[PDB]
Write a protein that binds this ligand. Sequence first.
Ligand SMILES: [Ca+2]
Ligand SMILES: [Cl-]
Lengths: 413, 420, 413, 418
Amino acid sequence: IVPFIRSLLMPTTGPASIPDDTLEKHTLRSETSTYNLTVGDTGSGLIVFFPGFPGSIVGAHYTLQSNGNYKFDQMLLTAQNLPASYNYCRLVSRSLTVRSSTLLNGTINAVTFQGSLSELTDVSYNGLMSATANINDKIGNVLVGEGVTVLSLPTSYDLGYVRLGDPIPAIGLDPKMVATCDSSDRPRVYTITAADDYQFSSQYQSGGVTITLFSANIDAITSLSIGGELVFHTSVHGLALDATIYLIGFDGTTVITRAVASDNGLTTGIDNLMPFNLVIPTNEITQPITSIKLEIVTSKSGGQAGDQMSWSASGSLAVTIHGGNYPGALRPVTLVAYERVATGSVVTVAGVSNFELIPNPELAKNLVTEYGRFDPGAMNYTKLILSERERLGIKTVWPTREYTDFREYFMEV
Amino acid sequence: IVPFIRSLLMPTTGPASIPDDTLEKHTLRSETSTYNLTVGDTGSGLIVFFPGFPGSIVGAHYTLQSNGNYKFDQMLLTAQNLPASYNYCRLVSRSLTVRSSTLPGGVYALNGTINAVTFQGSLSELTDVSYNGLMSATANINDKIGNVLVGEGVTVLSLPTSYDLGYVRLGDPIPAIGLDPKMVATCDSSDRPRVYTITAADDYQFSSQYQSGGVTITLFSANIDAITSLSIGGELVFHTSVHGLALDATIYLIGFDGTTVITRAVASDNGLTTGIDNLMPFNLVIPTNEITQPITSIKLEIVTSKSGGQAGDQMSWSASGSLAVTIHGGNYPGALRPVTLVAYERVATGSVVTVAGVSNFELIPNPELAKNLVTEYGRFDPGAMNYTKLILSERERLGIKTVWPTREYTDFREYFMEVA
Amino acid sequence: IVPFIRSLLMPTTGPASIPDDTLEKHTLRSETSTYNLTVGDTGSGLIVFFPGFPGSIVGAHYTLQSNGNYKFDQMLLTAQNLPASYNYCRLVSRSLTVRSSTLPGLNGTINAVTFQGSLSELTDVSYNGLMSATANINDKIGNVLVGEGVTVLSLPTSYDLGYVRLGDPIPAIGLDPKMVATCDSSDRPRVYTITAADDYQFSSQYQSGGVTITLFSANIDAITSLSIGGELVFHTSVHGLALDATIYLIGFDGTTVITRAVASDNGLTTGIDNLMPFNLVIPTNEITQPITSIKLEIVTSKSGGQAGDQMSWSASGSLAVTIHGGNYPGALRPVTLVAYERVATGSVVTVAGVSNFELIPNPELAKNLVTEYGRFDPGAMNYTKLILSERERLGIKTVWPTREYTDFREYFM
Amino acid sequence: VPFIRSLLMPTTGPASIPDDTLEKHTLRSETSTYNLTVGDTGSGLIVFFPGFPGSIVGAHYTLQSNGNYKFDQMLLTAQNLPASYNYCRLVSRSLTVRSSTLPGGVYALNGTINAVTFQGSLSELTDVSYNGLMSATANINDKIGNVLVGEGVTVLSLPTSYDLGYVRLGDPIPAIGLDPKMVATCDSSDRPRVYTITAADDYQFSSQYQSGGVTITLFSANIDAITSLSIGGELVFHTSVHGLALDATIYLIGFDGTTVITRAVASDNGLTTGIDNLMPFNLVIPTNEITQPITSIKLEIVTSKSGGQAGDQMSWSASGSLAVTIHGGNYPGALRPVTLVAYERVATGSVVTVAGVSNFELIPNPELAKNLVTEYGRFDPGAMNYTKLILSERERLGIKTVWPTREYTDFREYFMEV
Ligand SMILES: [Ca+2]
Ligand SMILES: [Cl-]
């Protein structure tokens, strides 16, 4: 039987080279993921998986709080940090199982959504059953003790190798200095026109008046840039602006704040320029970002109760998520939700990720790389299997008992 | 016969999945395009088609004016705006026919001819866009067609510019709320950007006698191409020995018809301090909804002024700097190149030039539609790609054109449905 | 025989279309490369080749100086400048031979290796050090006699690569005769993210003229246009301080290739966020030799100051260095190094090669150059995959002692 | 296979449907021929009911300068089936639309057509403009764009289910009455369509007196009807004000916005304070009163106070629901699907010519039964499977519901050879 197909459908058996046309000298590796997550007091929670992520980021766990909000717990990664040993990567296959081990203890709903985290319209335990219309991309009310298996299915082949966000040789006065070469090919770009002759008007107030000009859903796991410019016009004298950008997490928490304008004084009758020159590095992102908002504070230094403060603005920003549109980098997303699990129980996660990799300079001295086994009918066979996906029942989310049966039905044929 | 081949060569029969290695779960759709364009007073005009555009923009119509300049009429799109229902797209196949359908009351004689050609570059790269000059835009005999009767019509057939192309983000709206009711937020076509680099000045010396109101110059003008969002960055550094000088700088994006599509202030009353590097950064983002017609050039204007100046004293400065124009997803094959031009002349004024076609796509639904639209990997068809490669390699022998006199394309369709 | 395989393994026989799925109407061309390089007084040197470069840049020659440093000699290009006639390109195959052709008044050996990273990533570039840059026995060759020479053969780093924009000039007019405008290689950018400071504390006693520091230095790679964006934010309690900041791009030989002012007499206001944006664009025509590092200099000054006056500030910030089209396979990696030593001073090291391309003509040439999809050859790709997978068994090298490569050619014909 | 021939080429005549609805019947073809006149905008719309089980083929509307459509006339079959038959089933049908003339002053060609088959009924379309129609369906074989009017378009009726029952034709029944204008028919009834509307749920109405009463429209809803329907239900009115009286009328509006039928549902109905005032409807709208397809219904209420004076108050609260039953409305083909043929830029005064054939399975009325033999119909073992095979390969075969006539003609040849 075809190694690649075996690897694709049964990732835990090991890696195999993707039988496409991306002929690069590489090496094959398997990285395990093991976590024992703790259940909060509502007995409900959510694990967000990035099934196709080309690297060490596997997912994020959130617990549902009594007030109905989610709260970030932690990231789910591979056993080792790939960027420390390799510079390029391609995902070959992956599978993870989620089940309670601190065992009749609750149920799981799981779905594979074709967009990115912030694009979900409903993330409730029952709402997720509608995120996709594909019957083989959703699974409902599986007992937590039996568990669910997430299987990564392709979102395109002939994908390029991805830079891993590996550190680069650098020295600096600051011991907290960080330098990396980031995943960049195939950037995702968001364009936000925040104002088109927007008129702001308000009575003076010591300390100024704050407004949130806009708030938009965006997705980011790794480095991103925010560029652009706002132009302000005013008839009033003595106004000064303070502007700040906030990147918010899925749990509503602020993840990043950046000053864009500080005591920026406005001159009457002229175009007042407010540029954006922001770069958010990966190490600063502590949990997935799902929204961005801009705050503007208007103030009049020598003002007094009664003066009117006003200005008009026009402008657009561009948010670039480096490598964001690389299939698997932000989309798709597989959600595994659980409810009614006894508080304090352990939700156990166990999986394998298989990659095609290019070693970093030091490791390259000892790691041989090759083009990889020629297998003439491997791709055709894969295309045949995936086109017959519904007839064969190949799911992205499975009740583990069924996936196990599926594995037998495959090895004994 | 191989459904993909049938869709490729006869787009109006419907869509089919591209038999390459880009295995994504998707859905297949057909969008029609129907337009009844009006002929201006010169009886001449030009339709610019973007045969490989991965989305709803099919082309643009320009009428030729008596003064010899073109004038933008309107964009030609698909029946519905794909970005409103889908987030990702790939072009499978497309064909459009152009022919006259009317004669205003009074004209007894039908008149008019069409010249059409497929140019492997983007709009602003054409060296000649006159009715007869187009015939030389390419050397490939199967990518040009001349003097076809307007009443018979021409058929534009989209031929591949590479397979295994990735899905493209459609410029779909994202969830957002704002104080401004005119606020707009989208996720744009970005993979494979096109980048233009312009060194506007390398120690350029500017010198001129003061003048109330300032002195204006146009530092440079360059041809670039943009249909959707783009950004402009970089910087100009100014040096001066004169005191009291201030600069005003503006960027202009010009359309194919010479008109200004977009203007952006880059510098406003920016004072220049002597014996210091004066910095003028560019931080411009031009969203898609602001581009009303294809952009074919960019130019930079600088206004030098001396507030407390009088007739007689000299104004001057030296500058150095570069800008980078990034067209988001601009180099995605089909996004800007290639271009198919259909020119017509001698058509009775007031007649109707009718456009009708179909576009076929592989699409990924937006979140709301994904709740009701099933997506799949798509029929396995073992020899479809080989057959496609064989047909295209024999393109000249088989006579598969990108532009056809419609009668011939119709004959070609029959000769195809018989042999298969 | 399958044309493509013949072209791939024996580039000097001419071009052939790559049998992948990138179906573009194109034309095929061969560009030769010929150089007679002069050996310096140490008798030692280094030629850096970009085997997969999609265009006219073939390599760079450096001589080793008595003091142990390298010194840039010149670039190695194709006979004609492709961007002047074509706008898009893909590399089909390439091979170059390096051998001594002169005696002034035998001498010397060559070590060569193909490294899977880019120039600045090499950990050791000495004649002997190179032998360990890779672990692949077929990507290194040692102590070949210079008179016999070495042959560098370009092997694929992925197929189904897109066409690359060539950096061709665009129509433009300007007041400055020195004005330059091009459309650059851009798809698949490489991005470096550098966090230069995270509340970095700076402090020093005044000094007429200012105190200079080099905040950081990092290795990066660039051959063609790149851009630098981002921002530094400065805080200070002292009054009257002003900053000057400069970016330097350094070449492989340690020399300064490019310098850009980022801040000039930028005064710092107390108790506020002082913004220092980066808006640099470095055009290809300004890069005279490969860039291997970037550093930032900051000069702090207090105009009206006197001994005892203390100058201090804290800073935070990140920059993003974007190398346009830098991650396109072949544009920066891999690199093939050919080092020679003990060659008589004043000798001629002769370089001779052929580069084969798929090209799309510029507008003017398109009027007379016919383009086509290219020969259908059903099993060409499979055969290529088979050959590359049996690379080790067949002994297909990226660097060869020329005599062996010649025997290999016969054994093939 | 005769059935297939009839289904794909209706003009060749009728054939029995090879399903399981074994009834003794007779087979007939009824032609449709119309010469429609183009209005001053040069634009118009013909609405076809491709699957209608009877003589109603369609309706023609012209587009007016103000942007609204104006009803011209119904398109029927040569003869009125209900006059000779009592039951019916549609076998197959096709119609062509093309211009056949030129108002003097124009000499070559003028006009284009957009056509589409929508799977809903008329009022359910979201956009009926010339260009908007192109999106009514996502099926490429159910739409056709910018066909030259001189060449024409062909509408081909494709099935919306088989094993459909026979439909009563709305035939007259023996009846005598004192009124010469009396009418009695047995209507299409099987498979009614039903709309349920809640017009008010404690709605508060409040207004100042006014001579003649104060009028309001409680609700307005899109519904579809071509033949008889009934409207039943009840409104309940509560009030604290004494002396109030209500007048309530139901309006059935046509596709062109005009009122087609009105029925009083309350006349001078006085409201008693502190009690539930009931207002029951029992409206039966017979087919002959419906002059053009109905696309909406609205409820008008006039509140008055006979002995009131300026400054007097009028208020009440209301609750109510109604059921609109379209007899036989959900019978497949009766209301849905619909095929729209839109034309524009046609010279004013030109003639848009319609020509088609409808094939039916029929059961004669009592008088005709005396002379018309009926039978079960040819046994054709594989006709149904062949039909199912052709329809499943619809996209591969290119079998359209709307065609540029030249292509349909080519399609006919390619079939008569194979
Ligand atoms: Ca491929
Ligand atoms: Cl890219």
